[PDB]
Amino acid sequence: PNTVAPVGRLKLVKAEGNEVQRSDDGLFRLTAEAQAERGAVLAADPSIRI
Amino acid sequence: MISSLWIAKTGLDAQQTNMDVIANNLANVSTNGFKRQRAVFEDLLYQTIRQPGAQSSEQTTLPSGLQIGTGVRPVATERLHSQGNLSQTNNSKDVAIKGQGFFQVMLPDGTSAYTRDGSFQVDQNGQLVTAGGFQVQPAITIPANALSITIGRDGVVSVTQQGQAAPVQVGQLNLTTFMNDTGLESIGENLYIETQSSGAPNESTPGLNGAGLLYQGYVETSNVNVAEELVNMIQVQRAYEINSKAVSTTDQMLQKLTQL
Amino acid sequence: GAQSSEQTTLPSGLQIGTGVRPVATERLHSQGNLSQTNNSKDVAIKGQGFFQ
Amino acid sequence: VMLPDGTSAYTRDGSFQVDQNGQLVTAGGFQVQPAITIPANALSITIGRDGVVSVTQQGQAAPVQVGQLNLTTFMNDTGLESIGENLYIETQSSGAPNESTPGLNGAGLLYQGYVETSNVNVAEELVNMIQVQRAYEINSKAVSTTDQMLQKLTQL
Amino acid sequence: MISSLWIAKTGLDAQQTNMDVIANNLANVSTNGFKRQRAVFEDLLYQTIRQPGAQSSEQTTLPSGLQIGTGVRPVATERLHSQGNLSQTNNSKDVAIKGQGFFQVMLPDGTSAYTRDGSFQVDQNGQLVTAGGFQVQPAITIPANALSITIGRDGVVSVTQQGQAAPVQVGQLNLTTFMNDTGLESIGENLYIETQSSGAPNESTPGLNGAGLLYQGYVETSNVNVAEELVNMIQVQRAYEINSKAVSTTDQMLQKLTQL
Amino acid sequence: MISSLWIAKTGLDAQQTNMDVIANNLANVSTNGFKRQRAVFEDLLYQTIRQPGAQSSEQTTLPSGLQIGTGVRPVATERLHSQGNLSQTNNSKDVAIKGQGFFQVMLPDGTSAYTRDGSFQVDQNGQLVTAGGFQVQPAITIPANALSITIGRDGVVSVTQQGQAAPVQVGQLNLTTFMNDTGLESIGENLYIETQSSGAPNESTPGLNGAGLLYQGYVETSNVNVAEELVNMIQVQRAYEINSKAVSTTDQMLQKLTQL
Amino acid sequence: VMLPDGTSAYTRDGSFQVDQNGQLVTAGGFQVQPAITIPANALSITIGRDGV
Amino acid sequence: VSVTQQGQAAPVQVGQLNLTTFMNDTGLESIGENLYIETQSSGAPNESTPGL
Amino acid sequence: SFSQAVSGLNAAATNLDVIGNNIANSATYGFKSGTASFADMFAGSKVGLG
Amino acid sequence: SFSQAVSGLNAAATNLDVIGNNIANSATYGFKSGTASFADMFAGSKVGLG
């Protein structure tokens, strides 16, 4: 048991909810304003806890 | 269907086994050369929900993860191969071994057992058999018209005939010692059979290589201490009652869930 | 002594007794004390033997 | 103690026996790591207060030393993982074991003839089980009330 | 989930530890130089629902606010350091100290402990040791061919030789006194070790500065009064029963509540 | 299951050992050259709930912490080598030793044992042996046609021959001494052997280096004071019953607890 | 476990019985693949912690 | 907080567990794992030794 | 504890039997008085056996 | 209470032994009679030790 080793880290994003639109398959994506103001892809923030 | 029921069942079974060995010790307190038994317990496996020491952040780790038990299981029983007390019988054919070792006994099928209960009788052929008909392996043959039988400390047996003004040797007693006394398997006639745990037997005359001496006219009593057995019985009863209480509590909560 | 593993064997197994039974009642053919009765036909033997 | 697969575990239960090879093993066959061996025809095995093991013999007038029971200490005892057979193994949560003689560097001492019991308080278990039974019943009642109000809602 | 339940738990625990110290005192009633123990309890914190002395109006104040208890806890245990009765063994190597003091003992590790049990032996090297091999710190070495050993009221010790027709001094049994005897930490083998709340030890000769004298041939018995222990056992049994009744009442009340 | 129960069990065991040594002393009250036994106990470890002398605050310290005992153990069982009373048997083959020392004896295996009782006989071959067939180590051989055997205060032995009216010397009886007489390992048939606890034996002629003298025609009785055994037995019975009462009280508390 | 049609299936339920030929089989008649056989006149059967 | 060593009689101090207080404890924002974080409704925390 | 007491009782009975036999055979011509000698028995150390 | 009584009993036994020694030593030419001397012992005050 003393050989546990990290093998990666998830990417969590924080979207307010007024700038995300559902796709046609159940997934959510940034809208035009959201991607314009926060870049093409969001950056993971350490404040998110799971 | 609840883990608590399964755990409490194992607890009750362990207490039952302990009470069983206590009662077995209490039964033959009058058996010559009987050794008490003690049961040792050991818990079962564990279910790990959260692995201890796993990372909880980039730098912190869980000091101790979630880990649930599964119950208890008896693992072994040990015979207290101590020295029992010696009682006098004034019977010339009763021999008590003081120290370590066993008398070898030739079973009817041809195998060999080992006994510490020294109470010998002579059958119609002159053989020095044990109580039960099995004869001692070195084949001591007592001749007729024997006034008395003398067995020395070094296990040399001689008889006093009508004349000759000197006893004549008729055989010798040899004692076998084992590496692990507690390892022998008992078969239920004050007899133990050699098994893999105990080493190979090696005969030795009394008084050599740590083997005990022989006293004629004495018999070794069982080393059972009833003063401890009574307290053990009290503790066993209380533990059984507590486990039954746990079973009852689990049943009550299951019934309440059913009524939901 | 069971082969509990490839190399380790249990030093002592699990065995439960089933009680105790009497096996024999042996007589002690020792010599009793002799007494005096001063009777013509009272005979006591010292040692071994039996009248038939 | 040493498991058959080479790895080493740790235990508090001192109840030892001797196998056919004269090696001090636990009740279960696992041998103690410092490899204490007992010679043949031993008369009395004595264990010192600081782990030294001596044995008497037939004609010898002095005990002969046969081994030492050095024991390990951990930085965090609670972090050890507990495997079933009354054994513990070290984890990353606990520190690396450090082996030492008894009585030094905060290590304990050894008593021969006695075995450590279990530190389970009976009087607390019963009240705890009463408490958990009552809490279980209360939560069941909460479930029942939620079910009834949901049924009333969906009935209309 | 009820305050009464957690209060009754503390009450039960207090009664249990009281019974435990009573049993410990009754156990070693024959141990030489054993000082009995008694436990001191204190109540836990109080919840102030309404503040005492609060201004109840423009002129009035609350005589006493609403305060609720929380339970009990054992706060300490103290050993009554009185003088035990002296019994006679007619043994030249038994010393009983009358008064206050402790013999200093050199532990094998290198630390020094202090003991009250005066019952000494001589090892193979001719050094005075306690029952257990720990040597007396002043390092008294009794020479061989010692006809007799005499220890006076003070600490001087002499040995009578075959010749010279006069005793010869071979050491002195200085004993240590403490500012606070109860503050000594107790370990096994009838030994105490210095702590912060005990003060620095004070070496002294017997009979000076309040140090007691030494009697040879006597041994000090434990100061345990079984007549008080029996009534203590009755009292703790009744208190445990009362607390158990309180637990049962709370359980019944909660069970009847949860049937709605 | 309860610490009180285990403590009381240890107390019961200690009282049982005390009663056993009392019975052993009383049984061989008439054995020549027997030394009575005495058992010494000590307290077991202590569980420290609150460390004494702990730093309670920035400037306040606990005068005495919370410590709980866990029982009593018999640390040792030692002989009391006093000088037994000298009897008058007016026999020529029994010698009593006044002071210290032991007679040396050659065991059958080949080692050396030591005895205190002097009551000798002659084997069929003329050797001077103790009761049991063990000959004296210096091998004193009594010749035939011996009128009388004389032993002085020293070890010198003489035999009055039939003729020549001039006694001759046929050996000497030296005595062995030990640094620690209580460390001798006692065995059966009234014998002792050397261990590491006792010192290396040293030979000495009687009356030299503190060794005792020899008296012919006297025998040494056991130093068992039958007067003290009765009162010790009464005390043992009382203590045993009190510990049994403690066990009963603990069982009552457990039974009341389980009735919830 | 060896199925009748040759294929092999994997089971975690341990409840084994001895067949007429001695082969260890599962409750239902399907036999264990490693083909462990038990001789007759056997006093007692033991199974090690590492499957011996 | 103090810890007693092996040989040393006097305990050695290793640290102080001072604790914080707030002007309005109700306004703390609760998250998982029994944790509270400061908000604008609760005043700035102040640290102090216990009992003062 | 019981067996040691039994052994001591038997030893005392034997001694008294010897005394009675000696006192009964008084006035016999070719008679020599008999005496009894006892011996302790230990298993190891601290374990008396009567 | 046991210790005081036992100590007194031992003192009485010692006195009786001395008296027996004196009476049995009569007709010994170079002999002087022996007499025992006793002393009470107190721990502090109001506490008896025998």
From Swiss-Prot, chain A:
Paired cysteines (S-S): none
Subcellular localization, as worded in the UniProt entry: Bacterial flagellum basal body
Quaternary structure and partners: The basal body constitutes a major portion of the flagellar organelle and consists of five rings (E,L,P,S, and M) mounted on a central rod. The rod consists of about 26 subunits of FlgG in the distal portion, and FlgB, FlgC and FlgF are thought to build up the proximal portion of the rod with about 6 subunits each.
Family (UniProt): Belongs to the flagella basal body rod proteins family.
Stated name of the protein: Flagellar basal-body rod protein FlgF
Upper classification of the organism: Bacteria, Pseudomonadati, Pseudomonadota, Gammaproteobacteria, Enterobacterales
Primary gene name: flgF
From Swiss-Prot, chain C:
Localization per Swiss-Prot or TrEMBL: Bacterial flagellum basal body
Assembly behavior: The basal body constitutes a major portion of the flagellar organelle and consists of four rings (L,P,S, and M) mounted on a central rod. The rod consists of about 26 subunits of FlgG in the distal portion, and FlgB, FlgC and FlgF are thought to build up the proximal portion of the rod with about 6 subunits each.
The family this protein is said to belong to: Belongs to the flagella basal body rod proteins family.
Protein name, per record: Flagellar basal-body rod protein FlgG
Organism: Salmonella typhimurium (strain LT2 / SGSC1412 / ATCC 700720)
Gene: flgG
Full protein stretch here: 53 to 104 of 260
UniProtKB/Swiss-Prot annotation, chain G:
Family that this chain belongs to: Belongs to the flagella basal body rod proteins family.
UniProt subcellular location: Bacterial flagellum basal body
Protein source organism: Salmonella typhimurium (strain LT2 / SGSC1412 / ATCC 700720)
Gene: flgG
Name of the protein described by the UniProt record: Flagellar basal-body rod protein FlgG
Description of how the protein assembles with itself and partners: The basal body constitutes a major portion of the flagellar organelle and consists of four rings (L,P,S, and M) mounted on a central rod. The rod consists of about 26 subunits of FlgG in the distal portion, and FlgB, FlgC and FlgF are thought to build up the proximal portion of the rod with about 6 subunits each.
Curated annotation (Swiss-Prot), chains I, J:
Coiled coil regions in record: none
Superkingdom of origin: Bacteria
Cell compartments where the protein resides: Bacterial flagellum basal body
Signal peptide positions (record): none
Similarity remark: Belongs to the flagella basal body rod proteins family.
Name of this chain's protein: Flagellar hook protein FlgE
Taxonomic path: Bacteria, Pseudomonadati, Pseudomonadota, Gammaproteobacteria, Enterobacterales
Stretch of the intact protein here: 2 to 51 of 403
